[PDB]
């Protein structure tokens, strides 16, 4: 057994199949988003970032930067322990209070990331309820799939956004059986929005817990910037709302929000929460300032939706196909894996436009796409450059 | 099934066994470690922190803070993507190069936490080697256990730091199957140091990969501050060295260091790496300044061991028993979850001393203890206050 040679051959497989991926070394320009320096072997050059999940540019928001500077100087670089052992910081406490209020819940629990919040929460909740059946939306994110897998709990997959199929996969279970319905508000690849109320109607008929990942809604929708459930006024119907601090809130971290009992349960039992250093105080302080700002201000969401709407209108006039949807995500459709990569490469090296190809297995074969995430900071000129680039590229594909 | 009542009943179980934990709300005073403000219902009081894993106080190091302030103003609050999609920042690159160099390896891979570096790397490595048997030290950290469990690979546990038991467990195995020995350099709860060279001898004689968690070693031992393998001159013998940026380096994050091939392998396949936002640029810039500092400077490590030896000597002199060991961790043994918790509650309320009980998952039961972590910033006066506090409690509580 040559381990070195073994790992190398696994990678040659990925190279051959065209799925080996190299990172772009970027430096976003704080104060000048969506601009970034792209570090290429032959020296720096500027790009426009078009596939960042920092959806509102809160990454450069002055209130977020100020809170992080002040937290660094008061409390230092890091937490310096787990939440249990010397790593509970006042900013963690204010952030959990703020997240509870955002979602109208009794409590919230902060994790190191969105990924860990789902992995830790789902695996701990299901594994500690013997005979729990998990009902998982087939397009749930990797973090939810891995939490559900790690639970070892019996799991039934229901058809994407289909409450009739959910009902059919709940109908034979005893009401005394623990059940957990795990789904998202906004799904990243197609940008579709879940029928949350219809799903909660089926969940309540069967005494099932509801676990809603609002990663792609929170900060972006609702009167409080709480996400889709906030928008629909049905926050109170979910047992748990999960989210990230890394996307619309523009920093890093994950959380859940729910009853005192459920948050205390995950806090007291979840390995991935207990046995990992707490997020840096400055990370907690930035997220706190980001949430406070997006609860009080609608201006960024309004500008966000205008940029999204303007891009779609211009693509429509230019004849550039994108997948219609009610969210803020603009999946520009390519339909061929090799061509998707060729277009991504040409946008970066000829047009200074940074987008990434999305190919099988992330998305079904024939539905390969460029996932575009317009921000409040993308200008009309940025949109015209991107639309003209895609239009010129599609004409050359044509010829 | 009432979910609320079910959750409360399990929490009432932790209260019954005395292992329900109330978090202390602290603000560490940057520039004034080890002081913290403690927010209680009563209000705000100053305490001395004695169980932080920011072992050298790099959390308040001015070169670390300078780099973090700089990175915020240049790049913003967060990465704004995954490493694959818009979230690779130049600080991540310089940090992975620095970690490779620290451990004398070809490459390094940055994760969001030490916990995730272990869970993701061990799950991915074992998963993707058909018929792999994982041999795990008895006392491996939760993060390593969960990585091993998540792999679904065949697992053998070997007796703590026992290369002869590792030999016996490896001996009965299909000789053609891939094999991975997972262990730590320095174990947190007893502070014992692994016989890395002897474990590596047994791994080599059976064609086994070695995976070494140096979380409580890296930054604190070795000519390069690389940890125990660095100190023993055997970094080259381990297939993977794993560590944290959160403890001696004083920020947050996890990594592995190894060949370009093993790091690229985990980078390309591990869900917990691929599908999670990259660490903030400021975190990467801080961890980078921390490592460059502790590679070039042994003065904090020397002051660290000075404070450790001084506390151990004063504890012995006052008749307060601690678990002797070759590392920097001073475990004061108690006996009982409820007593240990009471001693910990009395140190805060009567003495302004913050030390957490170690309960009945982490350690065995009848073996709850006070884990104390002296840092370079603890003064002779702080040590006298701690030791006289423990002395007074120890007579009252009959542990003298």
mmCIF file of C-alpha atoms in Angstrom, chain A residues 1-12, chain B residues 125 128-130 175-179 203-204 206-210 239 259 261-262 265:
data_model
loop_
_atom_site.group_PDB
_atom_site.id
_atom_site.type_symbol
_atom_site.label_atom_id
_atom_site.label_comp_id
_atom_site.label_asym_id
_atom_site.label_seq_id
_atom_site.Cartn_x
_atom_site.Cartn_y
_atom_site.Cartn_z
ATOM 1 C CA UNK A 1 0.000 0.000 0.000
ATOM 2 C CA UNK A 2 1.658 3.199 -1.370
ATOM 3 C CA UNK A 3 -0.643 5.881 0.272
ATOM 4 C CA UNK A 4 1.116 8.825 -1.563
ATOM 5 C CA UNK A 5 0.600 7.103 -4.992
ATOM 6 C CA UNK A 6 -2.997 6.110 -3.991
ATOM 7 C CA UNK A 7 -4.074 9.754 -3.229
ATOM 8 C CA UNK A 8 -2.349 11.008 -6.487
ATOM 9 C CA UNK A 9 -4.326 8.407 -8.615
ATOM 10 C CA UNK A 10 -7.680 9.443 -7.006
ATOM 11 C CA UNK A 11 -6.869 13.051 -8.133
ATOM 12 C CA UNK A 12 -5.896 11.931 -11.727
ATOM 13 C CA UNK B 125 -9.426 9.593 4.159
ATOM 14 C CA UNK B 128 -12.266 6.605 0.204
ATOM 15 C CA UNK B 129 -9.806 3.771 1.082
ATOM 16 C CA UNK B 130 -11.883 0.587 0.635
ATOM 17 C CA UNK B 175 -2.071 -7.496 5.557
ATOM 18 C CA UNK B 176 -3.300 -6.039 2.158
ATOM 19 C CA UNK B 177 -5.946 -3.674 3.743
ATOM 20 C CA UNK B 178 -5.118 0.067 4.075
ATOM 21 C CA UNK B 179 -4.428 1.048 7.745
ATOM 22 C CA UNK B 203 2.883 1.854 11.989
ATOM 23 C CA UNK B 204 5.906 1.448 9.552
ATOM 24 C CA UNK B 206 2.619 -2.775 9.247
ATOM 25 C CA UNK B 207 2.500 -0.323 6.226
ATOM 26 C CA UNK B 208 0.097 2.073 8.123
ATOM 27 C CA UNK B 209 -0.493 5.834 7.545
ATOM 28 C CA UNK B 210 -0.095 7.995 10.676
ATOM 29 C CA UNK B 239 1.655 11.072 6.999
ATOM 30 C CA UNK B 259 2.127 15.808 1.007
ATOM 31 C CA UNK B 261 -1.292 14.693 -2.744
ATOM 32 C CA UNK B 262 -2.932 13.988 0.672
ATOM 33 C CA UNK B 265 -7.127 14.702 -1.867
#
